[PDB]
Write an enzyme that holds these catalytic residues in place. Structure first.
Site, PDB file in Angstrom:
ATOM      1  N   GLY A 207      -0.552  25.507  50.952  1.00  0.00           N
ATOM      2  CA  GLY A 207      -0.566  24.128  51.420  1.00  0.00           C
ATOM      3  C   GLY A 207       0.486  23.259  50.742  1.00  0.00           C
TER       4      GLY A 207
ATOM      5  CB  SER B  11      10.479  24.661  50.996  1.00  0.00           C
ATOM      6  OG  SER B  11       9.459  24.104  50.174  1.00  0.00           O
TER       7      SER B  11
ATOM      8  CB  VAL C  28       5.653  27.461  49.213  1.00  0.00           C
ATOM      9  CG1 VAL C  28       5.152  28.114  47.928  1.00  0.00           C
ATOM     10  CG2 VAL C  28       6.909  26.645  48.941  1.00  0.00           C
TER      11      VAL C  28
ATOM     12  CE  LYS D 122      11.200  25.032  47.356  1.00  0.00           C
ATOM     13  NZ  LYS D 122      11.720  24.390  46.104  1.00  0.00           N
TER      14      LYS D 122
ATOM     15  CG  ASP E 299       9.867  14.731  44.972  1.00  0.00           C
ATOM     16  OD1 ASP E 299       9.414  13.611  45.289  1.00  0.00           O
ATOM     17  OD2 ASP E 299       9.802  15.718  45.738  1.00  0.00           O
TER      18      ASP E 299
HETATM   19  O1  LIG Z   1       8.664  24.381  45.093  1.00  0.00           O
HETATM   20  C1  LIG Z   1       8.461  25.064  44.058  1.00  0.00           C
HETATM   21  O2  LIG Z   1       9.264  25.177  43.100  1.00  0.00           O
HETATM   22  C2  LIG Z   1       7.091  25.777  43.964  1.00  0.00           C
HETATM   23  C3  LIG Z   1       6.133  25.621  44.964  1.00  0.00           C
HETATM   24  C4  LIG Z   1       4.914  26.277  44.812  1.00  0.00           C
HETATM   25  C5  LIG Z   1       4.701  27.064  43.662  1.00  0.00           C
HETATM   26  N1  LIG Z   1       5.602  27.244  42.679  1.00  0.00           N
HETATM   27  C6  LIG Z   1       6.796  26.599  42.839  1.00  0.00           C
END
Ligand SMILES: O=C(O)c1cccnc1
Length: 313
Positions: free
Chosen positions: A41, A42, A44, A59, A147
């Site tokens: 819940g 790019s 991922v 990701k 962010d």
């Molecule tokens: O966007 C990232 O770096 C990310 C997203 C989920 C889990 N670990 C890293």
């Protein structure tokens, strides 16, 4: 002008290779070593490394992007093994689509919407401390996250684990460099961004951290809920005060383009449903983070020394 109060020249003191991300050349391995089992819940995914059975996170990056891939990979590599920073394991490419992806350590996130309802005062102190460790580390490595928001702070409340993730917006801090102000998510943008001040620094992350703290102790998430970029500043002024906004603008020689409001007491946000999360020390730390003046905000290292965190230390 303006420059950071604490790690101003650290990138200057490092080899150019460190921060010159456009010259960085990633080595792309084969993504078919990874089985993408569960969309998180790019795009991922929770994944399995099929060779060693290790549980990881993959990701998928936007292929068309070149520069921002180079930047994110270089920053992750510089930050590897930093405290509570997500750990980049591999950089791979799909054979068929040739689309680049990043492989990370797995963390099982709770999802802040449900988590923030059951957190105790101690937990908030605990996780804010963990998050400050991440920010002091990356700031000390010359990097602004830009962010910071609940969605980029993974929390495994079962294991009491925290990871700051999503460094695709992150940048190297160089004094007097002018940065894009339309970074971050609306709700967590510092006023410096909203008034188009481009010479910002690590303290932008400290504003964002303050929004997180406020939303957690007050249980109003997001705390500053602007309807668009403009309204975002009005929401802030409704709390920090319109006349104080101008004082900040007059300083730093900033040309604004709202209403009248006057500064609220942080105490005015307390009611029956959050009183058990709010303390005087939380409100003092909060008042030192959510400040118009980015140079007045506590640095992450300073915030970690605040009395708010004594019970966690
Ligand atoms: O966007 C990232 O770096 C990310 C997203 C989920 C889990 N670990 C890293």
């Amino acid at each position: 002008g303006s420059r950071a109060r604490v790690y101003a020249e650290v990138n200057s003191l490092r080899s150019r290779e460190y921060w010159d991300y456009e010259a960085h050349v990633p080595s792309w391995g084969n993504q078919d070593d990874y089985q993408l089992v569960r969309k998180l819940g790019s795009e991922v995914f929770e994944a399995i490394n099929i060779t060693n059975n290790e549980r990881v996170v993959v990701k998928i990056l936007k292929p068309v992007k070149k520069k921002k891939i180079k930047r994110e990979v270089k920053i992750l590599e510089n930050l590897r093994g930093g405290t509570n920073i997500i750990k980049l394991i591999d950089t791979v490419k799909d054979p068929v689509s040739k689309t680049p992806a990043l492989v990370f350590e797995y963390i099982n996130n709770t999802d802040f919407k449900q988590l923030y309802q059951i957190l105790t005062d101690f937990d908030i102190r605990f996780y804010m401390y963990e998050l400050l460790k991440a920010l002091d580390y990356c700031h000390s490595k010359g990097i602004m996250h830009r962010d910071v928001k609940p969605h980029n702070v993974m929390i495994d409340h079962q294991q009491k684990k925290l990871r700051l993730i999503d460094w695709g917006l992150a940048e190297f801090y160089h004094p007097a460099q002018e940065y894009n102000v339309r970074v971050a998510s609306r709700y967590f943008k510092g006023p410096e961004l909203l008034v188009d001040y481009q010479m910002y620094d690590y303290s932008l992350d400290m504003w964002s951290l303050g929004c997180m703290l406020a939303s957690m102790i007050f249980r109003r998430e997001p705390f500053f809920h602007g309807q668009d970029n403009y309204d975002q500043l009005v929401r802030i002024a409704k709390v920090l005060g319109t006349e104080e906004l101008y004082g900040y603008l007059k300083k730093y020689h900033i040309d604004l383009d709202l209403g009248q409001h006057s500064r609220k007491r942080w105490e005015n946000f307390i009611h029956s449903e959050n009183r058990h999360l709010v303390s005087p020390e939380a409100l003092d730390l909060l008042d030192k983070l959510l400040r118009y003046d980015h140079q007045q905000r506590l640095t992450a290292k300073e915030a970690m020394e605040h009395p708010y965190f004594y019970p966690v230390v």
